[PDB]
Amino acid sequence: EYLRANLVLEVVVNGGPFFYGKMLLGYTPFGYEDSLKNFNRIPIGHQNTMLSQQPHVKIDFCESTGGVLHLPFVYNRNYMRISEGSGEPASMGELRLNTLNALKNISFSVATITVFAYLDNVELVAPSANDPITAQQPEL
Amino acid sequence: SPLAIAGNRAGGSGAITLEPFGSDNTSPELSKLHFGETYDHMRVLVKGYNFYKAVLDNTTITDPDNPSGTVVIRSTVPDFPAPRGHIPNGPDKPFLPHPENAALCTHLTWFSPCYVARRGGIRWKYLHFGARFGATDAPKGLGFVNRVPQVPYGRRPLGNERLPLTDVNGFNPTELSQAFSNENGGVYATDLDVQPAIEVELPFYSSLRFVNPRWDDYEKIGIHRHSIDLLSYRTNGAKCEDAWMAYVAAGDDFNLSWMLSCPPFRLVNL
Amino acid sequence: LPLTDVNGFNPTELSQAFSNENGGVYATDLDVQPAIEVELPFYSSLRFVNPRWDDYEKIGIHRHSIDLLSYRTNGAKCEDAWMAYVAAGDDFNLSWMLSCPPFRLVNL
Amino acid sequence: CRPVVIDPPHKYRPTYVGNMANADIAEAVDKLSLTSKQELTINHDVIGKKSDGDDMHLSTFFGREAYMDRFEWKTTDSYDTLLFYTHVHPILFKRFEATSGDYDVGMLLPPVGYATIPFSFWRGGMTFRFSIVASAFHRGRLRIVYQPQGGLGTVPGFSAAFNRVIDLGDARDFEVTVEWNQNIAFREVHTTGSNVPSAQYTPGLDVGRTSQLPLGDQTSVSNGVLAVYVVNDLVSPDGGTDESVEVNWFVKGAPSFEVASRDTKFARWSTHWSQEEF
Amino acid sequence: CRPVVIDPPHKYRPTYVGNMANADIAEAVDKLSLTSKQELTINHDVIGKKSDGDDMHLSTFFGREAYMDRFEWKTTDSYDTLLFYTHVHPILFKRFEATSGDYDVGMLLPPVGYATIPFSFWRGGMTFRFSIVASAFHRGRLRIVYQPQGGLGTVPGFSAAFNRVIDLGDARDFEVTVEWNQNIAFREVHTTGSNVPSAQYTPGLDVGRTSQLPLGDQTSVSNGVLAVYVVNDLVSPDGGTDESVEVNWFVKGAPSFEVASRDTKFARWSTHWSQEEF
Amino acid sequence: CRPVVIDPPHKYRPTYVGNMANADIAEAVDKLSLTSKQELTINHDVIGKKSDGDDM
Amino acid sequence: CRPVVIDPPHKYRPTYVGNMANADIAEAVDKLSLTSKQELTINHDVIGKKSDGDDM
Amino acid sequence: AVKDTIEGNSETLSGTHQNETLALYSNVDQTAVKIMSSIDPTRADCVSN
Known part of the structure; x- marks a missing residue:
């Protein structure tokens, strides 16, 4: 019925020495659903100002480096309900990936990026005869 | 290339120091030269009082059945200043498009939205004033402030109810009980003729670890509420002739936990 | 500043006649306490000022305000006033005795 | 009621409303609890994250970095051209216009700028960090100049004022801190009278401003002026006339x-910018 | 009146009515006795019975057992059928209708339920005891299941949730205690808006309710759900189709x-139910 | 205004006019001098004649 | 509110306006600062000239 | 002054680690922002064995 663990994120980048681009990846803790309809109305440039003050990482395309993020369990309860119909997991955090500086190229045209995730210090409690949240394959 | 990777970590800890402009030379006895004291701690600063949102009852004067002649006027309000502007719900113009909250931005609604968690008590100061606009002045009356606890059924709504007390033969012991309650964790009582001010501190009593300081909706912050009511004579059912002045500060255990980021703002006029 | 309208007190005009008072107000009710005692600090950002100043606005660089809320007033009469008694604070200072200036007998 | 009291009288000073200005004296209030000793914790650890210190201290705002804007290099640039110009004071606004479908406006401030709004005087040092976004085959050299007072209406020398020459090689992301260099102990804090503040720094690509001319006349609130000039032209392998490079500053x-005052200028602002135009 | 007083003044804060919320500060009241030190005993022994402790402590209410209701076994029952279902919270009402000649109504609560009415939040464990009334020639086996949240709308497994299997042999009167198994620290307290409360447990023979279907949706006030299922059919020597057996629970x-709040929901109830219909 | 006062209340007995009958208790009056300790002598010798004792 | 107060009463003498004649007794005024201990210097040396003594 | 709690937890790691099923190898350095959790002895309520 309940779970408590810490999030670990990792990014993998691959770009040549002819690209010289930059990107930003930020995280917003619990409580972000309230200001979500308005945050989407802000220009990308002004969004980067606030994201730079939160736990984030910078992606460099001239090199191929960056991305490790350890996040704590922040919640006003002791655990989160993972049973069917729960919306608690979808309200614990958010990941943003927006452009900082546009990608260029020294000619004489596409880069890639991949993000992984897992948990650590996992605690599973409260046995129950209840089905969990309906499984879904990641969109990308 | 090592020097280009180490200089890319968050916070700018790999940047190159560049022999700064001038030097830092400040003496310990500079506060004794200017301003007397220091302002380096925001927890101490937030314990001062700020004017906020004089409380009126000008919303029930519309229906042609409001009681007059020694009635009770009650207002229910949240426990937090409920930031200024055209908040979605609004206590000041509900039965009219685009309700708003005619308040002022205090030192509590400015430093709070830059945080993740909020917990602690709030202190209030209510000062009474009011006239009669003719019909030569009556005595002040009685004033009470009491809490409204959480209950799954039949909880008190938010604000601006009026209740009668008299009948053809004067005071009724029955109507005087329908306009009050047990007050098992609430009321502080006083007489406004010899004491016009009310000082109260309201605890947290949350059952949760914290709440969201970025809340904006009036009812979302109104989960913890209290009520201020006054008993006055010779009132009019279509006029608002009494009000309170509210000053808000921070309690002895007020806390703000994680500084996330600074939100946007603008210039708002009513 | 006005406070009322056709239907009595207005929560909007009551905010336009006040402010945050983030470093200011001391409040009281004049029916049970008619006097106000206050001490105002220096807060100059300079080391000192000129005690030989004469212009009203030059000395008015540091100012404060006294206001009162009263009912049944008249718009063409002055029916309220305050009596001001002035003393020196706990850190009042005068540094260099230069010379004694002139004076005269002034009547109004 | 056997004895009588023979103690001398005293004076009272009723003080009906109490003290609403100090923040260190005890208060005669009525706690609406069961006991008079009820009290929670101030741990900062009960939310789930380890605390680095008192998060209510003002030092946590002075020290949180923030990305502001970008400016270009434009390799087709002469050997002495102005690239950046700003006033050294924490109140730097940024105005946006609600990209999605409605009409709304807002403003943003750095963590240092946000915390000094409720105050009237400020002093101390400020730190700047410039990061160049270029490949491994870009070469050039830039200059950073500081003017304590008056502004830089024309290209200065190389040693008349404080100067720094840095080169675009295998190292980027330079940082520099400006200290207090005024004849007065404290300066004033900038305010805004309308919803569209005046420009405080020259071209910023996020705010759609691209004028390279030097603005000025803000001596009473600032701690000087920062400027960026070219020294050696930017060199790229492909070829100029179409190539640029962007620099980000924090x-x-x-x-x-330091801040020491109390002000009431934010008394009518609001953090609810969502629907205020109608 | 020889000397003069040179002591500094002070502030008063009249406080005409006093403090009506705290319960630990002294009071300025006028005792209507001869002396100011008049005082009786708090012995609890002056009534004639030896005291086991402070009877005004709330622990004396949490710990007093009470018979609630009965349900049947009905040996003509399949191997998996629901016999009992309840919500784990102390507010369980029981409504009667004044058997003698008049029209009157009333309600009853257990000692645990009675003491948590003036409060708004509750937490802790609760103890249940089931006693089977059968002869020395009855054999069978039963099951007890607990679901922390969601309810049991269908027959569960045997190890997915907490289960217990007990047999009707030479031993009866089994007891079990449920601890706190929620993700929140405290829960809410149930109230009633009318004089006929909704059903909180399934069939109880005293209240004339015999529906065996599982009720639910009381997650915000309860600490889970208890259910009783058959495992092995009840065996009797005489013969089925007319034989049952009753089980009593406490x-x-x-x-x-634990309880920690103050509430005003009982402000208009009354213990005088005798003549209120007329 | 950080802490709160948890001291018990008391009784006042205003006594606006004061005590006009006794002659040994202190008085709450306002001396119209610069200091609160101003005081002359009770010598009886400052008039020019030696005193045989308290003439009062 | 468990015990009761058994202390004898007293006399008050409100003194609404205070003492405006003496210059050595403490005053019950409201400082309009953040702390109650704010205080500058009386050095006479912070103006730029060495002091020969108390110029007041 | 207090810790910046953003650029006070940054540090650089090697691009080689293992998780008992996925192992990654790289020669370039990474950047880490490790924000640790609290002890919270009161956060363990539904704990059985």
């Missing part, structure tokens, strides 16, 4: 930052 | 029970 507060 | 509070 602002912060030095550990010697 | 409720209590574990030594870890």
Whole structure:
């Protein structure tokens, strides 16, 4: 019925020495659903100002480096309900990936990026005869 | 290339120091030269009082059945200043498009939205004033402030109810009980003729670890509420002739936990 | 500043006649306490000022305000006033005795 | 009621409303609890994250970095051209216009700028960090100049004022801190009278401003002026006339930052910018 | 009147009415006795019975057992059928209708339920005890299941949730205690808006309710759900199709029970139910 | 205004006019001098004649 | 509110306006600062000239 | 002054680690922002064995 663990994120980048681009990846803790309809109305440039003050990482395309993020369990309860119909997991955090500086190229045209995730210090409690949240394959 | 990777970590800890402009030379006895004291701690600063949102009852004067002649006027309000502007719900113009909250931005609604968690008590100061606009002045009356606890059924709504007390033969012991309650964790009582001010501190009593300081909706912050009511004579059912002045500060255990980021703002006029 | 309208007190005009008072107000009710005692600090950002100043606005660089809320007033009469008694604070200072200036007998 | 009291009288000073200005004296209030000793914790650890210190201390605002804007290099640039110009004071606004479908406006401030709004005087040092976004085959050299007072209406020398020459090689992301260099102990804090503040720094690509001319006349609130000039032209392998390079800058507060006042200028602002136009 | 007083003044804060919320500060009241030190005893022994402790402590209410109701076994029952279902919270009402000649109504609560009415939040463990009334020639086996949240709308497994299998042999009168198994620290307290409360447990023979279907949706006030299922059919010597067996259950509070609030929901109830219909 | 006062209340007995009958208790009056300790002598010798004792 | 107060009463003498004649007794005024201990210097040396003594 | 709690937890790691099923190898350095959790002895309520 309940779970408590810490999030670990990792990014993998691959770009040549002819690209010289930059990107930003930020995280917003619990409580972000309230200001979500308005945050989407802000220009990308002004969004980067606030994201730079939160736990984030910078992606460099001239090199191929960056991305490790350890996040704590922040919640006003002791655990989160993972049973069917729960919306608690979808309200614990958010990941943003927006452009900082546009990608260029020294000619004489596409880069890639991949993000992984897992948990650590996992605690599973409260046995129950209840089905969990309906499984879904990641969109990308 | 090592020097280009180490200089890319968050916070700018790999940047190159560049022999700064001038030097830092400040003496310990500079506060004794200017301003007397220091302002380096925001927890101490937030314990001062700020004017906020004089409380009126000008919303029930519309229906042609409001009681007059020694009635009770009650207002229910949240426990937090409920930031200024055209908040979605609004206590000041509900039965009219685009309700708003005619308040002022205090030192509590400015430093709070830059945080993740909020917990602690709030202190209030209510000062009474009011006239009669003719019909030569009556005595002040009685004033009470009491809490409204959480209950799954039949909880008190938010604000601006009026209740009668008299009948053809004067005071009724029955109507005087329908306009009050047990007050098992609430009321502080006083007489406004010899004491016009009310000082109260309201605890947290949350059952949760914290709440969201970025809340904006009036009812979302109104989960913890209290009520201020006054008993006055010779009132009019279509006029608002009494009000309170509210000053808000921070309690002895007020806390703000994680500084996330600074939100946007603008210039708002009513 | 006005406070009322056709239907009595207005929560909007009551905010336009006040402010945050983030470093200011001391409040009281004049029916049970008619006097106000206050001490105002220096807060100059300079080391000192000129005690030989004469212009009203030059000395008015540091100012404060006294206001009162009263009912049944008249718009063409002055029916309220305050009596001001002035003393020196706990850190009042005068540094260099230069010379004694002139004076005269002034009547109004 | 056997004896009588023979103690001398005293004076009272009723004080009906109490003290609403100080923040260190006890208060005669009525706690609406069961006991008079009820009290929670101030641990900062009960939310789930380990605390680095008192998060209610003002030092946590002076020291949080923030990305502001970008400016270009434009390799087709002469050997002495102005690239950046700003005033050294924490109140730097940024105005946006609600990209999605409605009409709304807002403003943003750095963590240092946000915390000094409720105050009237400020002093101390500020830290700047410039990061160049270029490949491994870009070469050039730039200059950073500081003018304590008056502004730089024309290209200065190389040693008349404080100068720094840095080169675009295998190292980027330079940082520099400006200390207090005024003849007065404290300066004033900038305010805004309308919803569209005046420009405080020259071209910023996020705000759609691209004028390279030097603005000025803000001596009473600032701690000088920062400027960026070219020294050696930017060199690229492909070829100029179509190639540029972007530089990002961040602002912060030095550990010697200070504010000491109380002000009521934010008394009618609001953090609810969502629907206020109708 | 020889000397003069040179002591500094002070502030008063009249406080005409006093403090009506705290319960630990002294009071300025006028005792209507001869002396100011008049005082009786708090012995609890002056009534004639030896005291086991402070009877005004709330622990004496959390720990007093009470018979609630009965349900049947009905040996003509399949191997998996629901016999009992209840919500784990102390507010369990029982409504009667004044058997003698008049029209009157009333309600009853267990000692644990009675003491938590003036409060708004509760937490802790609760103890249940089931006693089977059968002869020395009855054989069978039963099951007890607990679901922390969601309810049991269908027959569960045997190890997915907590289960217990007990057999009707030479031993009866089994007891079990449920601890706190929620993700929140405290729960809410149930109230009633009318004089006929909704059903909180399934068939009880005293209240004339015999529906065996599982009720639910009380997650915000309860600490889970208890259910009773058959495992092995009841065996009797005479012969089925006319034979049943009754089970009685009792409720209590574990030594870890807790309440912390103050509420005003009982402000218009009354213990005088005798003549209120007319 | 950080802490709160948890001291018990008391009784006042205003006594606006004061005590006009006794002659040994202190008085709450306002001396119209610069200091609160101003005081002359009770010598009886400052008039020019030696005193045989308290003439009062 | 468990015990009761058994202390004898007293006399008050309100003194609404205070003492405006003496210059050595403490005053019950409201400082309009953040702390109650704010205080500058009386050095006479912070103006730039060495002091020969108390110029007041 | 207090810790910046953003650029006070940054540090650089090697691009080689293992998780008992996925192992990654790289020669370039990474950047880490490790924000640790609290002890919270009161956060363990539904704990059995």
